[PDB]
């Protein structure tokens, strides 16, 4: 913060009138509500002109049973990753200056235990017999404790021309069991990730986990909220800039099959990928952004 280096708070920041806007596009085939909120910041005391692009909207999860192959085997398509990406063409003079959020250093809680004890006893009965025991004990414990989200938010390695985030599936609770991930494997039941019952009396399709009891991101979807800061030199001859904005969904294939005794599930990674791209024009003189 500002006070940590003996300077009055808010002093070293960029603060000037700002020009803002909203641009909304809906991709029907890809089921993506894409909204770009932009702010043009022109601080004369700052050596660069700034454009802040906040990418919002919603990418639908589209957790859906897609095929029913008889009554033994059925297939479920589900979203394992949501991605948002911004890219400047290389010929551009404008640069990607900053981004939010970034990758945070995860933490874990470790705990070590040492217990030792002693115990004595006296025993007896009606035949006048009497016994005794003296025992001792030591025990060492190690406990690891940590928090994990259903989905991880990760900032991809940026350049000065391209940036992006991926919100990826980590693990999930299945009816107070698990947690399971894309790589969970059981010899009897295989991958129990979206498995409703271990054994029942129905067609395969019914045995998929009800999306209401799973992560709501899987079905109803994920709403990005990422910020990109682009800087522009005022003396450039060309005060126009193209920028590409991409929303993307990666879908995995979770299959259920019947092994004559119980259910077994199998998951194939990155089976499908829906990519929705749109190009925007940035006018640094007019301070407006269009598509």
């Amino acid at each position: 913060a500002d006070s940590d280096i003996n300077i009055k708070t808010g002093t070293t920041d960029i603060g000037t009138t700002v020009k803002t806007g909203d641009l909304v596009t809906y991709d029907k085939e890809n089921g993506m509500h894409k909204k770009v909120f932009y702010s043009f910041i022109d601080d004369k005391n700052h050596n660069k002109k700034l454009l802040v692009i906040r990418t919002k909207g919603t990418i639908a999860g589209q957790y859906r049973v897609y095929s029913e192959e008889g009554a033994n085997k059925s297939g479920l398509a589900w979203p394992s990753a949501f991605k948002v990406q911004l890219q400047l063409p290389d010929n551009e003079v404008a640069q990607i200056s900053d981004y939010y959020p970034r990758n945070s250093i995860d933490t874990k809680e470790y705990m070590s235990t040492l217990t030792y004890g002693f115990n004595g006893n006296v025993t007896g009965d009606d035949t006048g017999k009497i016994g005794g025991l003296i025992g001792a004990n030591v025990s060492i414990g190690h406990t690891l404790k940590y928090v994990q989200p259903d989905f991880k938010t990760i900032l991809e390695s940026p350049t000065d021309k391209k940036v992006g985030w991926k919100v990826i599936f980590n693990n999930m609770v299945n009816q107070n069991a698990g947690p399971y991930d894309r790589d969970s494997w059981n010899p009897v039941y295989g991958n129990q990730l979206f498995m409703k019952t271990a054994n029942g009396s129905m067609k395969a399709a019914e045995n998929f986990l009800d999306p209401n009891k799973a992560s709501s991101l899987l079905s109803s979807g994920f709403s990005p909220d990422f910020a990109t800061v682009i800087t522009m030199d005022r003396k450039a001859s060309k005060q126009q800039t193209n920028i590409d904005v991409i929303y993307e969904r990666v879908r995995d294939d979770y299959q259920l099959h019947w092994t004559s005794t119980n259910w077994k599930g199998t998951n194939t990674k990155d089976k499908w990928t829906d990519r929705s791209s749109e190009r925007y024009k940035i006018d640094w003189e007019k301070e407006e952004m269009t598509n």
Copy 2:
């Protein structure tokens, strides 16, 4: 936020005088108090005119014993879902830009424990006999921890013309037991979701759980608090826009029957649906919203 990217706070946002209003309607048949609070925001430095629509009011729960087939079987209607939906006609130029709340990523706390120990003991009695014993142990522990609300609030997959929320029944604690949900099944007791006593001596209607010990959303109801942001192009020819708002309640059927040794309950999903729809007119020039 703005300070995370080296910019003065509150800079990049939309801020100008605002035109606000209230529209209240009460649907008696559906037992729904529907209130719409709206705000017209016209910032010249913003590329579009804004309308914020907050949908509030209260959808009654109407948790009730509706049928009485003697003293052996009875039926309880209960609300499993509350829904709010806003929809623009497709031919409209205005777009759904933003919404609150959105879907949150759940988290869970995991714990791993590894313990190992040793113990010794020496035994004896008055017959001069001496015994001895040396033992060792290892133990592995896994603990999963997470929070579940009685009802889940979910933002449905939006487009730029339609948006909505569903507040759905998740699971619920029943008199220090459970928690139970719509799919809980016990071979003896079936679904014990709203079952008061397992095997008492009363009529079936009496045996439903007192709403005072269940989620207050079930009976007294749920008060929506959702916001939609619509953007409008100032240069559009038609500066008038219709918008339809739907309130919905979906009720499940929980029936109790006596098996001569016990009570057993059965739950039918989405048996009834109360749907209350109203149309509003949005005048962007006059900056006023009416019904």
Copy 3:
């Protein structure tokens, strides 16, 4: 909030506007109720309606009291199981109930699952040169449900555009590090021990009730409502006066203790008594004043 939708904070709210506020205080002696109405007239020209905020405060006494004493074997305690507040506009009124606070909040619960498994080896022996051996294994499944419970639940009753109300109801309560008990607790031997002081005692039934100092203060000293109701009124309306009835009421249960020649047993009758205190206020929207 506004910042969540890229708007300057406080932009979308009703404020730009002079407000006319007031206090009306009434004490109902027979019903033991202190009733305060704090009201605020907000007339924002940029708002499509006139606004009145009615904050219903004050305090409804608990009146937790031993009411009957049929000797030393039997006694009865009257206690408040519900506090209620209700506002109601007549149907012929043009003014509408627009909003209210508080509302019903969604409860949550903390769930915890444990799976533990272990092995142990062991060798035995003694002075007769004898040697024994032991290999054991174990597995264990644990499930924990965890949640917080208030002594009283605050509920917003199903509102209309003409009437609104809250009910603050008894939930459950700790009795001297035991329980918690509620209105429906039953023990075959002791019955409902909710306000039972001791299981065994040489003393009157009246003396065997739980000291109100050791119970929820809402039961005895009482509960102080803090509810807000927002009324909207159309400026074009012809009659710029609106009558409104405000009701405070208390529902009291009957908790009786009787001696079974060996011990104490408690019985609770629900909603035995109801104290209802109603009063009418006149809302003048032109004069921007509310009166009684």
Copy 4:
């Protein structure tokens, strides 16, 4: 809050006006009470009534003290079981008690249910070719109750439109990692162990009382009230003067220790002594000043 009902925060409150404040200090020597009244006259023209905020502060000394000594087998300790502060308008007054802080809050408690079940297998053996085995199973169901309790409870007494008051009462207390004990704790051997230092030692009874340094600081050094009362006055009233009575009081219990020939036994008598300090203030609404 206001933002909860779509209104700019601080809009509906009384402030949108210059305030006249003051301090009145009195010390009751015989009753050991420092009594301070901080008052504020608020006259908001947009408010239908004049406001006086009376904040009652100061400190009521605990006066935890060994008062009598009957030999070395029996001794008595006076201790504060309740502090009380009360404000009362004469009924003939036109001014009304409008609001008060703090009020009674709804307590909560944390409940837990646990269900565990497990299995274990085991094989044992010997050098005599002997072979043994066992297969066991287990179920266990647990209930946990968890909650927080203060040493003293702060309670708002049932107010009227003329009188209000708070009481800070003794609840329970830890005694050297034991207990907690309260006024009704009883042990057949030791009686009430609340303020006894040792169970069995060789000293006078006076010696065996708990060092106040190891007890609640309120018991000895005392309690500092911080309560606010809000009085409303109609401007159109003929008599713009109002008398108001402010009362501080301390309730002391009698804790006796005696020797019973083998161990120590403690007994507590409730509400034996009561120190009450009353004073009258004159409220002049026109001059906007409060005097003594």
Copy 5:
């Protein structure tokens, strides 16, 4: 707060002020005594205000004071820090307020009831078959609470005199205890500041290093107490004398050798260091001097 009674925040308070610093060092008593004062004269307030903040630092002076050979030694340590302000009785000015005050402690209590059943079947190669069916019940009570190394206590004030005492409560000793001034063990006595149970060194060596003990004991305690004094403007004598006293009470912790192990004994309130000083308050000039 004000918003709790439907009034705009900051309305009911007193809102130019004249402030000052007086510093004195008592070398003999090892006390750095600082008074920060503020004169507040609000026309809309019925009396003139003086806020007196008593700060500075009272050194702990945790030290081994005596060495009676190699079997016996004495440690002096601070069991109480005290601050006192006193107006003479004939003064018209009154003590109106003070901070901090005494807070009500809380404790966390939790009760558990567990009951279970267990079955088992046993057997061996001799075709023998055994069984057992068992049940269990258990009740647990848990008490939980937080206590500071020192308790900060506001002494019963009057309208002429006020004071605070910061007293030793209990303390952890090398992952053991906590111990207090009254802890007693029949073989070891009071193990409060004892380093080792049995080790061949001088008695002075066996005292706990101040670096592993509460820093208030050695380096000291910094008071931060405020007193609010009110004065009537119509008073004839617009001067007021006030005495401020800083105090340290030291206990005596003795270690002695019993030919097998160490034993500690603690005697309370053996020494008392009192540093008193008088200030002159001028309400007209709005200044406080010495």
Copy 6:
């Protein structure tokens, strides 16, 4: 804070003062480093020196990658064990490094001691009228140490008045609910299991490395520095231009997996590769601007 020393907050900090800010961005492709400098010139007349605040941000890619594959029994994985950022002024410069953020924070640990003791009795018998009894006792002492560990530790390296720097180093990490492991973890059978996916599987060595999605995101996608350096300059200095070198660098370790005919065995070589990216900036104190 200032209020802690009886001064109005914000009084003693630096701030008629106008600040001259700017951004410099370069991307080193060979080293995969997005390097951004945000600078602020602060010239407070009431301050004895001109100030320049340099904020080093951007992102150093983790570049967690399988780099060699010697069949299906041996593979190598290059991973980032340290990220570093360094700023250096040449010796001949009169300008000085005055301050920096973050600095090294003091770690803490929670210690716990438990002492439990108990007694138990039991009576035994059977159908042969035999009667037995046993009475036992136990004592136990427990010590628990508890502390929080980040995946990477942020260290401020020992600064001078000419150069400053930070290193963000790998500490330890959880591997699929196992570990946590660090660069020196060793198992006689499995070696270092830090990034080992399975104990014994049937795949290529390359396929047996832990999925970067299940590892610290700093390892693959990378680390984003956020460091501040405060440089002071005398106004009276002759050369109001100052060169400064900024270095971003990544230290990569070598984690190899090999098959021992029964299972997998991991080996980690420290500081095998070092990627260094340096850039020269010109600081102009008169023109109040920074360039490269």
Copy 7:
């Protein structure tokens, strides 16, 4: 705070224009970056002129293997205490008024548990034999819980002429073992504080704990952040004041030696002391501080 005594917040404080400055000096021999930030406050409504002296910079750890006596014995120098001291000459009329931080009162969490139980059991076998068992138990537990920092920050007993802080080594975790301090002793291992391995095959110098796994204060160093407030009477004749500032590092000597069966460590306290002093001139009239 002021609101605690019925006064508007910020009323009783000092506030006026302030004159601030920076003095940076680097002690190479002692490896100490020493920065002084000063603020002159002259409030006319305050009875004295104020100078706030903030001592910052960084004292390097210099955790280093210094000696090598073959391959069986070695020595490690480590910082056991960092110190900062400010001292006014006794003849000065200017006074040390205040200081931050001060000593905080530490706390601990104590909990006592009382548990008691009963159990029954019935036994039998195929020989028609019958057995019985009735048991009871009681147990009392005492648990202590508290937090201990790696280093303690302590304000030393100040006067009106001298003030200082010491940041001292408390204890430290050694590879999930310990924690150990300067007085830890094991008959077999001696002091295991900075010992890497109990018994291995390297030179002594190799067996010291990697500074990366120890407190970073030990190696990279400590950054002081201390404030001293000095008052000056405006009417004092001599409006100039010299002040000495001392930065100091106390290093302990941790030696490792091989006893032919395992490693044993020994630690000697306060072996070395690096002391770096600088004198500053305070001009109260010109409101400037120089070196």
